[PDB]
Amino acid sequence: GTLLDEAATAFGGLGPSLQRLVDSTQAIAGDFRANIDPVNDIIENSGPIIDS
Amino acid sequence: PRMPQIRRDITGLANLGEVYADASPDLFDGLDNAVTTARTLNEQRGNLDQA
């Protein structure tokens, strides 16, 4: 009973909310892996100019 | 693997922000007066070219 009450409290009406969460997570992760090369370039080359 | 470089970038960003914050007011006052003299020069572009 306690576990069911806690699960109902945590997952009351989060259907569309969790759907958006998962969809946004997967889209962001996929696009990030697609653009990992510019990300790596920024990470590796931003230090010189800024420290200069 | 690029995490020390991330740390370097963050520290450099903080230091550059501090330096820019220290140097900004003088730069912006100079930019205001430079806009004044730039409008002056633009109003007499023909005179400057003839000169």
Residues of A in contact with B8 (CB under 8 A): 47, 51
Answer yes or no: are the C-beta atoms of A47 and B9 closer than 8 Å: yes
Answer yes or no: are the C-beta atoms of B14 and A51 closer than 8 Å: no
Answer yes or no: are the C-beta atoms of B5 and A44 closer than 8 Å: yes
CA separation for the pair A22, A33 (Å, rounded): 17
What distances in angstroms separate CA B29 from CA B17, B26, B33, B34, one per listed residue?
A: 19, 5, 6, 8
Q: Is B7 on the interface with A (CB under 8 A)?
A: no
For chain A, the C-alpha Rg in angstroms (whole number) is 20
A51 phi and psi angles, rounded to 5 deg = -70, -30
Q: Which of residues 10-39 of B touch A (CB under 8 A)?
A: 12-13, 16
Method: cryo-EM
Answer yes or no: are the C-beta atoms of A48 and B12 closer than 8 Å: no
Resolution in A: 2.8
Query: Within A1-52, where are the H helices?
Result: 2-10, 15-34, 36-51
Answer yes or no: are the C-beta atoms of A49 and B14 closer than 8 Å: no
Q: What is the distance between the terminal CA atoms of chain A, rounded to a whole angstrom?
A: 62
